[PDB]
Amino acid sequence: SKPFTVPILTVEEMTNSRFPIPLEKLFTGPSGAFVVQPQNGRCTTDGVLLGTTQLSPVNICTFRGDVTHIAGSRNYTMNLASLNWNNYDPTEEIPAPLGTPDFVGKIQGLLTQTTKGDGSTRGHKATVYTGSAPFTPKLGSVQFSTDTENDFETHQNTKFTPVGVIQDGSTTHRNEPQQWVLPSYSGRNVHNVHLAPAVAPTFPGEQLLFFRSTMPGCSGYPNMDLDCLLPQEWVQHFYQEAAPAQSDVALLRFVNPDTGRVLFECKLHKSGYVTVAHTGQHDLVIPPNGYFRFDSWVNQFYTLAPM
């Protein structure tokens, strides 16, 4: 069988799979108090994409389509197209369009548009509230708010490029975004479908290992913590290699190439997440050149040493 590997990139060399920003650090903490079910950065080790996960880091939390202005408002409704500007088909067996945000929050970015006929362009600052009632990407439409009232044309290619998150209105400082709360992709009266499953540690004393980034903040006092189960480069690697999983768990060692020494060991579950043996909230202290190395296919009989 084709030999499994993980990328030899360092943490800082890799990209968050849930927002288009670099990874900064590794974090582990207890995850019992909430349901961990992100839909981006979901991939099996043998390359099967899950949830709303797609290959390109720049497409994460983007939207594409045409827009209509809502009368008397600074708001626009985008009728969603695919990443290639073709039609979006809601009957496809996915939670939402690939790359749709998988958390409840207010995402600020730029909404940009080109007029096909003459190549005239326009762009305005814009926010999407993924917890709002008109956030129905599964149905093929979402709403944006701007400061403009009169500028975007109908039936012209329009793009949302995410930049950061904001906190404002009725929420208290750092109470939003809520990274572990999924939006209702079809809106209020419809339950989500075809979700990548929630993940949790199974063995006692184990915790999830998160790949963590700090989201840019554009207004207010947002919670800028963003944790993903897999770096986007791992998703890309697994998808390409598509190496068959020889067990439920790949044993990874986090190694310092300067000294050749192993820092700690961890389990990469074939369904695409990592666990370590630790109790409590902990930011890992890692050397700048450290990376993960796949050492063996193991099983439940193998016990991780406490890190």
Partner 1 sequence: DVQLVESGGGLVQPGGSLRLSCAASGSIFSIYAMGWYRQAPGKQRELVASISSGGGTNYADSVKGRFTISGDNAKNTVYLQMNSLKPEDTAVYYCKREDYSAYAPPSGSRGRGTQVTVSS
Residues 260-279 that bind partner 1 (CB under 8 A): 265, 277
State which residue, 219 or 296, has the beta carbon closest to partner 1: 296
Please report whether residue 18 would count as binding its own copies according to CB under 8 A: no
Matching residue, tokens 């005239």: 120
CA dihedral 285, 286, 292, 293 (to 10 degrees): -110
List 68's β-bridge partners, or say none. Answer: 77
Residue 296 partner contact from partner 1, its own copies, none using kind-dependent CB cut-offs of 5 to 8 Å: partner 1
DSSP SS3 for 78: strand
Residue 159 near residue 62 (C-beta atoms within 8 A): yes
Matching residue, tokens 């991780």: 304
Please report whether residue 218 would count as binding its own copies according to CB under 8 A: yes
Residue 236 partner contact from partner 1, its own copies, none using kind-dependent CB cut-offs of 5 to 8 Å: its own copies
**What residue type is assigned to position 274 of the chain?**
V
Please report whether residue 172 would count as binding its own copies according to CB under 8 A: no
State which residue, 17 or 186, has the beta carbon closest to its own copies: 17
Shortest spacing between CB 284 and partner 1, in angstroms: 17
State which residue, 221 or 297, has the beta carbon closest to its own copies: 221
Please report whether residue 202 would count as binding partner 1 according to CB under 8 A: no
Please report whether residue 8 would count as binding partner 1 according to CB under 8 A: no
- Going by C-alpha positions, the residue among 77, 148, 158 that lies closest to residue 113 is 158
Distance CA 69, CA 75 (A): 6
Left (φ > 0), alpha (ψ -120 to 50) or beta: where does 113 sit? Answer: beta
Please report whether residue 197 would count as binding partner 1 according to CB under 8 A: no
Please report whether residue 255 would count as binding partner 1 according to CB under 8 A: no
Please report whether residue 209 would count as binding partner 1 according to CB under 8 A: no
Question: And the tokens for 53?
Answer: 């996960």
Pick one of 55, 181, 200, 262: the residue that binds its own copies (CB under 8 A).
55
